[PDB]
Protein backbone atom coordinates (compact mmCIF):
# COMPACT_ATOMS: atom_id res chain seq x y z
CA UNK A 1 0.00 0.00 0.00
CA UNK A 2 2.14 2.82 -1.39
CA UNK A 3 5.30 0.88 -0.63
CA UNK A 4 7.19 4.08 -1.42
CA UNK A 5 5.51 5.66 1.60
CA UNK A 6 6.23 2.60 3.74
CA UNK A 7 9.89 2.65 2.68
CA UNK A 8 10.05 6.37 3.49
CA UNK A 9 8.71 5.64 6.97
CA UNK A 10 11.23 2.81 7.25
CA UNK A 11 14.05 5.17 6.30
CA UNK A 12 12.92 7.74 8.86
CA UNK A 13 12.66 5.20 11.68
CA UNK A 14 15.92 3.47 10.77
CA UNK A 15 17.65 6.86 10.75
CA UNK A 16 16.17 7.25 14.23
CA UNK A 17 17.48 3.78 15.09
CA UNK A 18 20.72 4.71 13.33
CA UNK A 19 23.61 4.85 15.81
CA UNK A 20 27.14 5.58 14.58
CA UNK A 21 29.82 6.21 17.17
CA UNK A 22 33.51 7.01 17.46
CA UNK A 23 35.67 4.00 16.68
CA UNK A 24 39.23 5.31 16.88
CA UNK A 25 39.20 7.63 19.89
CA UNK A 26 39.25 5.23 22.83
CA UNK A 27 41.84 3.10 24.58
CA UNK A 28 41.75 -0.65 25.05
CA UNK A 29 39.66 -0.70 28.23
CA UNK A 30 37.31 1.94 26.81
CA UNK A 31 37.06 -0.12 23.62
CA UNK A 32 36.18 -3.23 25.61
CA UNK A 33 33.65 -1.26 27.65
CA UNK A 34 32.01 -0.03 24.44
CA UNK A 35 31.99 -3.55 23.02
CA UNK A 36 30.31 -4.86 26.17
CA UNK A 37 27.78 -2.02 26.07
CA UNK A 38 26.96 -2.84 22.46
CA UNK A 39 26.64 -6.52 23.37
CA UNK A 40 24.19 -5.72 26.15
CA UNK A 41 22.23 -3.34 23.90
CA UNK A 42 21.83 -5.93 21.16
CA UNK A 43 21.01 -8.48 23.86
CA UNK A 44 18.12 -6.24 24.88
CA UNK A 45 17.33 -6.17 21.17
CA UNK A 46 17.19 -9.97 21.07
CA UNK A 47 14.97 -10.12 24.15
CA UNK A 48 12.61 -7.45 22.82
CA UNK A 49 12.33 -9.10 19.41
CA UNK A 50 11.60 -12.42 21.10
CA UNK A 51 8.83 -10.58 22.95
CA UNK A 52 7.64 -9.18 19.63
CA UNK A 53 7.51 -12.65 18.06
CA UNK A 54 5.75 -14.22 21.04
CA UNK A 55 3.17 -11.44 21.27
CA UNK A 56 2.64 -11.70 17.51
CA UNK A 57 1.99 -15.42 17.95
CA UNK A 58 -0.52 -14.72 20.71
CA UNK A 59 -2.19 -12.00 18.63
CA UNK A 60 -2.38 -14.33 15.64
CA UNK A 61 -4.02 -16.99 17.79
CA UNK A 62 -6.55 -14.42 18.96
CA UNK A 63 -7.14 -13.44 15.33
CA UNK A 64 -7.80 -17.08 14.52
CA UNK A 65 -10.17 -17.27 17.49
CA UNK A 66 -12.11 -14.14 16.53
CA UNK A 67 -12.31 -15.15 12.87
CA UNK A 68 -13.50 -18.62 13.85
CA UNK A 69 -16.13 -17.21 16.19
CA UNK A 70 -17.40 -14.73 13.61
CA UNK A 71 -17.62 -17.61 11.14
CA UNK A 72 -19.51 -19.55 13.80
CA UNK A 73 -21.94 -16.63 13.70
CA UNK A 74 -23.27 -18.00 10.40
Amino acid sequence: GKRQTEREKKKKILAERRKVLAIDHLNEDQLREKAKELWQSIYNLEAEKFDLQEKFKQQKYEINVLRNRINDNQ
Partner: protein, 118 residues
Protein backbone atom coordinates in the same frame (compact mmCIF):
# COMPACT_ATOMS: atom_id res chain seq x y z
CA UNK B 1 -26.94 -33.24 39.37
CA UNK B 2 -27.22 -30.29 41.75
CA UNK B 3 -26.36 -26.93 40.22
CA UNK B 4 -24.05 -26.12 43.15
CA UNK B 5 -22.09 -29.33 42.56
CA UNK B 6 -21.62 -28.60 38.85
CA UNK B 7 -20.67 -25.00 39.65
CA UNK B 8 -18.06 -26.15 42.18
CA UNK B 9 -16.56 -28.66 39.75
CA UNK B 10 -16.46 -25.96 37.07
CA UNK B 11 -14.73 -23.65 39.54
CA UNK B 12 -12.13 -26.32 40.29
CA UNK B 13 -11.56 -26.88 36.58
CA UNK B 14 -11.09 -23.15 36.00
CA UNK B 15 -8.67 -22.83 38.92
CA UNK B 16 -6.65 -25.78 37.62
CA UNK B 17 -6.61 -24.24 34.14
CA UNK B 18 -5.35 -20.94 35.58
CA UNK B 19 -2.64 -22.76 37.54
CA UNK B 20 -1.54 -24.61 34.41
CA UNK B 21 -1.53 -21.32 32.49
CA UNK B 22 0.67 -19.67 35.13
CA UNK B 23 3.07 -22.63 35.15
CA UNK B 24 3.27 -22.57 31.35
CA UNK B 25 3.88 -18.82 31.52
CA UNK B 26 6.79 -19.40 33.90
CA UNK B 27 8.11 -22.08 31.55
CA UNK B 28 7.83 -19.76 28.55
CA UNK B 29 9.53 -16.93 30.44
CA UNK B 30 12.47 -19.14 31.40
CA UNK B 31 12.67 -20.68 27.93
CA UNK B 32 12.61 -17.26 26.28
CA UNK B 33 15.34 -16.03 28.60
CA UNK B 34 17.52 -19.05 27.86
CA UNK B 35 16.98 -18.93 24.10
CA UNK B 36 17.71 -15.19 24.03
CA UNK B 37 20.89 -16.10 25.89
CA UNK B 38 21.66 -18.59 23.11
CA UNK B 39 21.17 -15.93 20.43
CA UNK B 40 23.69 -13.58 22.06
CA UNK B 41 27.25 -14.79 21.83
CA UNK B 42 29.83 -14.37 24.61
CA UNK B 43 32.42 -11.62 24.25
CA UNK B 44 36.10 -12.14 25.12
CA UNK B 45 37.82 -8.81 24.58
CA UNK B 46 40.98 -9.58 26.57
CA UNK B 47 44.29 -9.29 24.74
CA UNK B 48 42.59 -7.50 21.84
CA UNK B 49 44.38 -4.90 19.76
CA UNK B 50 42.67 -1.67 18.84
CA UNK B 51 42.13 -2.72 15.23
CA UNK B 52 40.83 -6.19 16.13
CA UNK B 53 38.34 -5.04 18.75
CA UNK B 54 37.42 -2.02 16.62
CA UNK B 55 36.51 -4.31 13.72
CA UNK B 56 34.61 -6.58 16.10
CA UNK B 57 32.62 -3.65 17.45
CA UNK B 58 31.92 -2.38 13.94
CA UNK B 59 30.60 -5.82 13.03
CA UNK B 60 28.45 -5.71 16.15
CA UNK B 61 27.16 -2.27 15.15
CA UNK B 62 26.28 -3.48 11.66
CA UNK B 63 24.48 -6.47 13.16
CA UNK B 64 22.72 -4.08 15.56
CA UNK B 65 21.40 -2.00 12.68
CA UNK B 66 20.36 -5.24 10.99
CA UNK B 67 18.46 -6.10 14.18
CA UNK B 68 16.90 -2.64 13.94
CA UNK B 69 15.73 -3.39 10.40
CA UNK B 70 14.33 -6.80 11.37
CA UNK B 71 12.57 -5.28 14.37
CA UNK B 72 11.08 -2.67 12.05
CA UNK B 73 9.81 -5.50 9.85
CA UNK B 74 8.30 -7.45 12.74
CA UNK B 75 6.92 -4.22 14.23
CA UNK B 76 5.18 -3.32 10.98
CA UNK B 77 3.79 -6.85 10.92
CA UNK B 78 2.69 -6.60 14.55
CA UNK B 79 1.02 -3.26 13.81
CA UNK B 80 -0.83 -5.04 11.01
CA UNK B 81 -1.80 -7.71 13.54
CA UNK B 82 -3.03 -5.09 16.01
CA UNK B 83 -4.95 -3.34 13.23
CA UNK B 84 -6.72 -6.53 12.17
CA UNK B 85 -7.33 -7.33 15.85
CA UNK B 86 -9.05 -3.96 16.22
CA UNK B 87 -11.01 -4.63 13.04
CA UNK B 88 -12.14 -8.04 14.31
CA UNK B 89 -13.10 -6.54 17.66
CA UNK B 90 -15.03 -3.81 15.84
CA UNK B 91 -16.92 -6.27 13.65
CA UNK B 92 -17.74 -8.62 16.53
CA UNK B 93 -18.80 -5.66 18.66
CA UNK B 94 -21.02 -4.46 15.82
CA UNK B 95 -22.63 -7.89 15.51
CA UNK B 96 -23.29 -7.85 19.25
CA UNK B 97 -24.42 -4.22 19.00
CA UNK B 98 -27.21 -5.38 16.79
CA UNK B 99 -28.63 -6.06 20.27
CA UNK B 100 -26.31 -4.26 22.75
CA UNK B 101 -26.25 -0.54 21.90
CA UNK B 102 -27.31 1.30 25.10
CA UNK B 103 -25.41 -1.13 27.29
CA UNK B 104 -22.97 1.69 28.15
CA UNK B 105 -24.57 4.13 30.58
CA UNK B 106 -25.05 4.86 34.27
CA UNK B 107 -28.46 4.89 35.94
CA UNK B 108 -29.85 5.93 39.32
CA UNK B 109 -27.32 8.66 40.02
CA UNK B 110 -28.76 11.21 42.45
CA UNK B 111 -32.55 11.47 42.02
CA UNK B 112 -33.42 8.24 43.85
CA UNK B 113 -32.30 9.80 47.13
CA UNK B 114 -34.19 13.07 46.63
CA UNK B 115 -37.73 12.07 47.54
CA UNK B 116 -39.43 14.38 50.06
CA UNK B 117 -37.96 17.83 49.38
CA UNK B 118 -41.16 18.96 47.63
Amino acid sequence: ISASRKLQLKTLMLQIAKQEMEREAEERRGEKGRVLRTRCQPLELDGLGFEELQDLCRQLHARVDKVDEERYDVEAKVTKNITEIADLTQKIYDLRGKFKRPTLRRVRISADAMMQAL
